[PDB]
Assembly symmetry: C5
Homo-oligomer: 314 residues x 5
Amino acid sequence: RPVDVSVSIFINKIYGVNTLEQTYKVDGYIVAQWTGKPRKTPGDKPLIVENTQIERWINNGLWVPALEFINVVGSPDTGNKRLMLFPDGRVIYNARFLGSFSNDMDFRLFPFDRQQFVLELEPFSYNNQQLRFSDIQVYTENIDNEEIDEWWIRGKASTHISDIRYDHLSSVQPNQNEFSRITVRIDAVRKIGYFVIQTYLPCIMTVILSQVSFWLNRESVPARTVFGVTTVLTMTTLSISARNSLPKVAYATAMDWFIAVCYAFVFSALIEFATVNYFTKRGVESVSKIDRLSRIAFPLLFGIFNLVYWATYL
Amino acid sequence: RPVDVSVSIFINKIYGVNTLEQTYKVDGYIVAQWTGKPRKTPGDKPLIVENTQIERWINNGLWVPALEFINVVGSPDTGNKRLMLFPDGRVIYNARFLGSFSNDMDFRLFPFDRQQFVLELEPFSYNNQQLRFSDIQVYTENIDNEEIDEWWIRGKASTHISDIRYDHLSSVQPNQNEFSRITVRIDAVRKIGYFVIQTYLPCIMTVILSQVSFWLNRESVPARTVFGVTTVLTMTTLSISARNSLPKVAYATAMDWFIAVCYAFVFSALIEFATVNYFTKRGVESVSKIDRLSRIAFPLLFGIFNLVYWATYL
Amino acid sequence: RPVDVSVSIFINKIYGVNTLEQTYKVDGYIVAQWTGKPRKTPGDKPLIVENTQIERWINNGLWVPALEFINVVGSPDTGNKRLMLFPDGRVIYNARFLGSFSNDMDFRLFPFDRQQFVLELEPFSYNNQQLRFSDIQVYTENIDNEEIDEWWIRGKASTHISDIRYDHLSSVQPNQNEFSRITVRIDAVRKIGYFVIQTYLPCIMTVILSQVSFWLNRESVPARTVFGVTTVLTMTTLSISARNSLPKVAYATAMDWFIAVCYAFVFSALIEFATVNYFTKRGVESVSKIDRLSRIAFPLLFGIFNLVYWATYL
Amino acid sequence: RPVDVSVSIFINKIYGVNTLEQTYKVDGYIVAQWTGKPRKTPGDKPLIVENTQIERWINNGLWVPALEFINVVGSPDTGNKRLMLFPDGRVIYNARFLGSFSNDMDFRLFPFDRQQFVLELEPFSYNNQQLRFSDIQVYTENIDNEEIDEWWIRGKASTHISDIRYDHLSSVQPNQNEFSRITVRIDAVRKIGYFVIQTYLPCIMTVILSQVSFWLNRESVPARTVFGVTTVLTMTTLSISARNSLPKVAYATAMDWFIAVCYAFVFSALIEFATVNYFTKRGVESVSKIDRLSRIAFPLLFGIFNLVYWATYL
Amino acid sequence: RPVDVSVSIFINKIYGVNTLEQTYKVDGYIVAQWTGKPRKTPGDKPLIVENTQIERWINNGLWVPALEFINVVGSPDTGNKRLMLFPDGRVIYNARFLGSFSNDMDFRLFPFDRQQFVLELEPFSYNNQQLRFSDIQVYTENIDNEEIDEWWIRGKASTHISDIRYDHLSSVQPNQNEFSRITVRIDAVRKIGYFVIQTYLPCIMTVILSQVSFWLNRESVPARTVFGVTTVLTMTTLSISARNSLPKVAYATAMDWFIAVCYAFVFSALIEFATVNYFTKRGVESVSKIDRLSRIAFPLLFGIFNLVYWATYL
Ligand SMILES: CC(=O)[C@H]1CC[C@H]2[C@@H]3CC[C@H]4C[C@H](O)CC[C@]4(C)[C@H]3C(=O)C[C@]12C
Ligand SMILES: CC(=O)[C@H]1CC[C@H]2[C@@H]3CC[C@H]4C[C@H](O)CC[C@]4(C)[C@H]3C(=O)C[C@]12C
Ligand SMILES: CC(=O)[C@H]1CC[C@H]2[C@@H]3CC[C@H]4C[C@H](O)CC[C@]4(C)[C@H]3C(=O)C[C@]12C
Ligand SMILES: CC(=O)[C@H]1CC[C@H]2[C@@H]3CC[C@H]4C[C@H](O)CC[C@]4(C)[C@H]3C(=O)C[C@]12C
Ligand SMILES: CC(=O)[C@H]1CC[C@H]2[C@@H]3CC[C@H]4C[C@H](O)CC[C@]4(C)[C@H]3C(=O)C[C@]12C
């Protein structure tokens, strides 16, 4: 007695990925097919009914169940609606949907993170005892496979049919509070190219600039201080601007750890000079022993770190 | 004589918390049940009517009271609507809502503040003598309890039913102008991580950078002045950029007072040096005992301050 | 014969004040009551008609005039609509409105300006010979009077009813082209707290920083120049950023005049040092009497200026 | 035989002028009058039909032509619609329109440019052989002439009626593809106040700051270089921030030409100083006559430049 | 047997080009003509039916196929709709559309890139066996083919009719899953004027400013370091700010390569100075012949680069 419903979804385009609001817009077509009671169409041809004329048919008792996207931010922009009325009884609901979808996202591996563009479809007013999803096949490719859209699509779609228990229907439907839900997931990874130029490389070149102070002398204090404060302030601002593209989360990202280390070498380089200025009297010949090793200690310490960093997270 | 109305609300997700406009977006379901006049349904099953077809029923005299969200910023995004028509008379109104809600917020303890995500539900056109809310049940935790949405959810929801007197309905029914209101509150706390990295740490290291001037000498005036002006201006920009994440309120926040203190230590450090620069010839051997104590007075005075700060506000 | 219309407006909240666009958002309820032909309702109770069911009544010749907000930025967000049909004949139209309103604003006294949140209500299609507004009652205080909205509400509402002559209907209604207009005004004053921290204090501490150049010496020219250019440029950036919260108006504001002075003292301080640097050899012993007096002349001129400033504008 | 249609347009307000998108919002009323078949109204008074009830009238065969704004960005925000049915036959369509309009704008004389706020009105589905505009009257002044937000309304309105030939209807209407078009233009001039405060004066004072380097000496190279690099970079950023209030046009504006000159004097001052530093020993007694003459050439050239500039462009 | 449909599209204006979201807004009219079943119109004149009155015709069984824009971001802003019903059977659907369209764009040649503003029109519910596009005519030139605001339109439109195979109808339409698709392309080139003034010229003069350091001496280290760090940091910010007008793509643009080169000359000049500072005692006469030659090597190396750069990419 539960209505077996076959569902096919074609994803036309994915766009408007917003990491801040954790939303992403999905455009495509939807198809809902179920075998109902036979009817006599005008002619043996299948009857096709478009947007407005569908209302007159449900007014004559036609059964069209409302389907609902769960992980959506607002009522999706529904396009044109059509109805395929076959003589053997099978009904086919086809329409285009453009909605702003949401999904929980973890940024602990920013910007090397992997996230899932998920579609959560599930009917309304009809539980698993009344309406059941037979199968789901997502014909996303032939368009999707173009993955130069600010992300990298890795793998095909994943379809799964599950049963969700809503407790807020228990007061009204005893033991009838489970709904069949279709879930479609597409794994994707981020493209680190944009962030290398905005934060990573500016962090590196700032570190390179910060360490030039070692190679000057016990020279004009203005010079080695200007090198210090400019690199510290520059590294300070980059630490701020690097998170403006991220939600106000608590955990630290791989970009955060990279900045803190790059912050350390920059701040240490200044204190190193500030150290030899208090020890300008204890052991001064032409150059101290700190600079003679800091000119090599700092770059090598920083160099191997980048090797550990980029070898990881990749 | 007033109709007892049982209300159940299932919150799908809370998102889009905007501290500036003091809004927050809430998605979820609503259930409204009342006992009406008995009817003879087609079959013994309860009759289920979906979005558009409900309008035809109220045209035949069916009574569906309009419910209204008070603390909303604009007309909420109403999803799919359904009606459960039982033969014994009881009617059940179930629909999905996605709205931008508002609530009075106090920012005196920024960013350690506690706020409440509130839903204020109340009917339209029907007072408490005509329509009464029997009970309210919020089955929010099942989903909501995952709070990585820029805030920290601490505790379950609190439900309360009250009666509100609108004076602008006195003109039509004297003394019968009170409306039943359902109120749903969810306490929440902020995640200070983003603010630690964006303002607090940059303020601290700037203060740390400001105090390196002490450990130099009565040295090149350019150096110790560059330390002064850069740190003062840096602290000045941070004082401004720290408030762009807040509405144009009048009272000062815990972040504000914390910056003013960090502002004091930076400006005092410059004047401290600017003082010893006025005494460069009267009593100069190597160090002004002022600097010899400022190298210890400033960190300890600032160090104990952070202990006074973080012990408070927590 | 003109229909006397009683109007009551309940303001739920005023929010979203945008000084740039000179708009402001207003949420609340509206009530329009007029005496029609008597009828016999079902029971002596008043007949209540909700959103959609109004269509059936107005199609049957019921007279429900549409009321129109003049000073609105776009088509207001109409909430739920209701109709109270009384048996004694009086008809009552009640609905909730959320609209983005506009009003001409003068910003010559930024941020000490006084502005008016105005509602200009007036019907459509019905002149004063056909429809006249009897009285207006603004039930704003019950909620509004808690002035926590980036502004301070100073006083209750002020109502004015007038007759407006539209010349573009003279070609169609000779001498019958006057419309009854309801006007609701709420005076308000601005909260200078946000601007004290963003512009005033950074301007002041910059001026304080600008004068430290005097207390150095005829010293290292780099230092007193670094004090000079940084303070001028800092004051220049603050002079620009201070108007980004204002429309691109022509007249100068009280904040503008205050900055120009703060710009003058800072730029004068640099020119002063550049002057004593031109007199570095002709008449040099230890200090130019200019510095001996500028350390007192400038603060006294600056001190009395702020006192004259804040005594005014308040 | 073509239907003569009298048109009256009342402009309520012009607001939201965006120079970047070259759009502008116009709110007001519209009146369309044509003489139809006589009718018998209830009483000799004209019959008035409001927003929804018009649909029933056009459903009964009444001829109400849809009017269309050409230079609009999206479907304009249509307010309330009314219908005046006169007994002598003349029909009057009156409604309120709030739309975001567009017009080609030339910015070669930024910020002294002159622009026109244009309304291009033209019917749909009815050509000039079917519908013709008799006359047009724009009752704009009553309100409009008060402009306080970035522009100056200078002069009255200009009305013109024309016939436009669309070639894309020849396939559907051979030789009958011309539509009557109403065009309303309002000249306006820009208010340079905002730009004087944001760029022009800051450009001037920066140029003034650039020339103080002359009055120092062949002095501490840090000072006169700090004068050089800081002024060059400051003038560089102002050239950037000056165009963010403009679309990405190709031609250079009067503000651009003004900045390029101000850019030259700033960079020339550095090269001038950098020149005398290359000649510090070959022909040195006390001062390089270059600075002694640059102190007069530079201010006079800049002063006379503003005279050539501001005598023009005004 | 498939209905041949003639389609004409008139593009009124192209506006709102957003390179970030890769969208662009298109306003214009559409004409769809097909020869249908003969009918008896009132009079021999063609019957004209406007927006609302069309619904009654399709309600009486008239066949109006829904047409669909593929490369659209959301449900487009549909204007006024009209229907021409001819007695010989031919039906004509004419309407105005304003939609936000999208197209894949390649930014490797920023800002010398050439892009295509594409419209993808294709019907719904009717395959190529039922509805076929006979021909397409784009009458765009009348208001185009000259140039647009931020881009240059070069050439007339390009028309393409194709057959698109959707695999998601195979389960419901075996071998009948091909749709006729009209595609309209407009080639366009970018206007580099805005980018020359905003990034290129500031990058060039910054390199020029960086090279003045050579012409000082083995002089005050503060000066040549101030030249060094300021130019390096300035060039660093320009590398970031130049990409804020681009999506987060992975590939590097022609603007990126130009900045990286400009980054080298600035950074190389600093290392060059940092080299001669290491040789202040080891091989010192007055100047390191490196600086004596770098004053010629760098400009010529930079000069020839600009010739290679701008000769390319054009
Ligand atoms: C012997 C030595 O190398 C000296 C030279 C500079 C000094 C530091 C300067 C900045 C100081 C800020 C605050 O006073 C805390 C302490 C702080 C980090 C100092 C020290 O630990 C001692 C340092 C490192
Ligand atoms: C004698 C001495 O060592 C000098 C060095 C720095 C000087 C201060 C700099 C800032 C000044 C601002 C305004 O002129 C009021 C006075 C003000 C606070 C100065 C003084 O108290 C005197 C100081 C402490
Ligand atoms: C003798 C003396 O005290 C010198 C020190 C600073 C100099 C001024 C610096 C700013 C200059 C701007 C422009 O070059 C015009 C001239 C301008 C006002 C200079 C002077 O007239 C001479 C001044 C006042
Ligand atoms: C002899 C003289 O006074 C020197 C001092 C500063 C020098 C200029 C500084 C900027 C240089 C940029 C690039 O290195 C090309 C060359 C460039 C324009 C120099 C010159 O032609 C020679 C100048 C004017
Ligand atoms: C021999 C010579 O001319 C010196 C002058 C400047 C020095 C360089 C400055 C920047 C340094 C950054 C980090 O310390 C790694 C090493 C780094 C590249 C230095 C060196 O290789 C040695 C240089 C080239």
